[model samples]
Structure formats: C-alpha cells, structure tokens
Target: QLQESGGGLVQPGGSLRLSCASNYRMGWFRQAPGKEREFVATISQSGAATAYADSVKGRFTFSRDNAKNLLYLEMLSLEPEDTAVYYCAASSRVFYTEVLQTTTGYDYWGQGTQVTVSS
Candidate 1:
C-alpha cells in the first residue's frame, strides 16, 4: 500500500518534496489537464532509473531509503507554470523498464498531491 502527503502552496523559486511509502517498484509521475500521465522517475530494486522530461531532468531527483521502505521525489526551482498534480505509485515491476510486461501496472497508489507554485 502507498500514501502520499505533500501539497499546499510553494512560492516561485522554492521546492516541492513528496514522499511515498512502499517496498515495491516505486515511480513518480505527474499530470496536468489535457496532458497524459508523464513518468518523472522510477526507483527499481537495483538502482535509480530517471526518465524525467529533458527539461526538468536536471532539477528533479528520485531517491529511496530502503531501510524505511520509503521513496522520495523532489522538484526544485519551481515556477508558477510548474503547478500540477503529482502522484506516486507502487508497481509490480520497474516502471522505467522496457519489456513485454503486462502485470507491471501500479498496485498501490497515492491519492495524489496537488502542488501549486506562485509568486
């Protein structure tokens, strides 16, 4: 199971940190109206797999604390345009992996956190 809790309002130039608790395949994704779900990053049982968009790659990070069974996502230097709904999921397989995997869908998911950046 998984639960996410991070939202409210973040000022421009600030940062947003979200956390999810799960031991399975962990992934961070974001979505906005009219846009499809986008994979931000994934943490496998082995190591980190970053698939963040080319632009946000440098300002985002995905990490895990295996001992605590927790996964974390951090986005920095936020601007008003960065406001969106963020989500975290626990999957049966690595989210960033490429293979003929049908049972890799998310098993547990957070209700989702809505982050807004403003001046």
Candidate 2:
C-alpha cells in the first residue's frame, strides 16, 4: 500500500518535507495548477540508486529508509509557482514483448498532498 503525508501552506524561500511509505519502488511527482504533471524522483526497490528529473535536481532531495519502507522528499526554496498537488506512486518495471523493451511505470498512487506556496 502507498500513503502520502506532510504538506501544506508554505512561504517563498521556505521548505516542505513529504513522505511516502510503501512496499514497492517509490516515486514522487507533482502537478501544478493548470500545468502538466512533472516527475520529481524515484528510489529503486533495492534502495541502491535514485533517479531524479533535471528540473528538480538541485532543489529537491529524495531519500529512503529501507528498514522502515519509507520514501522521503524535501523541497527547498519554495516559490509561488511551486503550488501543486504532490503524488506518491508505487512503481515497477515491466517487460513488453510487443515492444521488446522494459519500462517502468507507476501502478498505485496515493491521495495527493496539496502544497500551496504563498505569502
């Protein structure tokens, strides 16, 4: 199961920390108001490596606690444009015989955490 926690009103320059606890590979994404959904980052199921999108590379941090089956994200130096609904997704890699390729995709999602940046 996947669950999301933490996030609320924040001011510019402040930070927001969010968490997702799941038993599978975990990923984080956000959708700004009237904007497309953006990928944030993901932690491998083995917790060996983490992949992050270039857009959030320097400003977002991703971490996991294998022992507790928890994934965490910290967004730094928030701005008004950062207002969005953040989602925690359970992901897995699947092989597509038709395409002869393996790809990863989100299978389960958490009730998004709303983050509003203002003031």
Candidate 3:
C-alpha cells in the first residue's frame, strides 16, 4: 500500500512535476545534486515541503498527495537555467511525536533523471 522513489521531467519554457513511489517516503537531503552519487535533495518530509531558499525561485515548490502517496515537486515559468537531477526518497517510520523525522537519507535513490530547459 506504500510506494516511493519515482518522478517526471520537462523541457525549457515547459513545466515538470515529479514524485517518488514504492514503499517509501520523501526524506531529507542537505546537499544538492552533482555532489552525490545518486539523485538526492535535502528535503525533510515533515509536511509538504515547508519552504524553499531564496536561491530557488518561488515558482519552484513541492507538495504531496496523501490520498495517492505521491510526493510532488513542480517548477514553473521554466527557463533554460533550470537543469538538474530530481530524486525521490523516503524515511521509514510512523509519523508521530516519538518517531525521528529523518531516518538516514534517501533510503532508495533514483537514477539521476535529467530535466533541462532550453530555447
């Protein structure tokens, strides 16, 4: 009934929304891509992506469909500058006060799926 680690991509001037699936949840990543072996994002699945850094445009946001267990990330007003790998990860635990929010880090990693925007 639980799935994690899966998503989609898009082209420049285009938009994309990706999510992870298969017995997992979107965990946390402190470091961005290029510095990791697998696609990873420093995201803590506490409750729908809390906030994005100023470096990341407000257009870039995340959400999860609990009804479908779909973790979502969408980038809008795409520009050629938006090109990177997006990964879906999950922390194993029942969401409760006693449970540690972060388990380790993307337990199941997705291959670096490339999404680029160009003219």
Off by over 4 Å in 1: 47-49, 94-96, 99-105
TM-score of each: 0.78, 0.83, 0.55
Worst 10 residues of 2 by lDDT: 95-104
Report the C-alpha lDDT of model 2 over 27-97, residue by residue, as the tens digit. 78888878878777877777666777777788998888888878889999988987888888876553212
Q: 1 or 3, which is superior by lDDT?
A: 1
* Tens-digit lDDT string for candidate 1 (5-111): 66669889999888876347667767766777666666676545445555477888888887887777788988776677878877766345542122245666677
lDDT of each: 0.70, 0.76, 0.48
Q: Considering every candidate listed, which one attains the maximal TM-score?
A: 2
| Residue 36 lDDT in candidate 3 | 39
Cα-lDDT of candidate 3: 0.48
The residue ranges of model 2 lying beyond 4 angstroms of the native Cα positions read 94-104
- Candidate 3 residue lDDT tens string, 9-98: 456567766554423445422233354332223344445344353444467666666666566666677765455555455555444232
For candidate 3, give the lDDT of residue 39.
Answer: 24
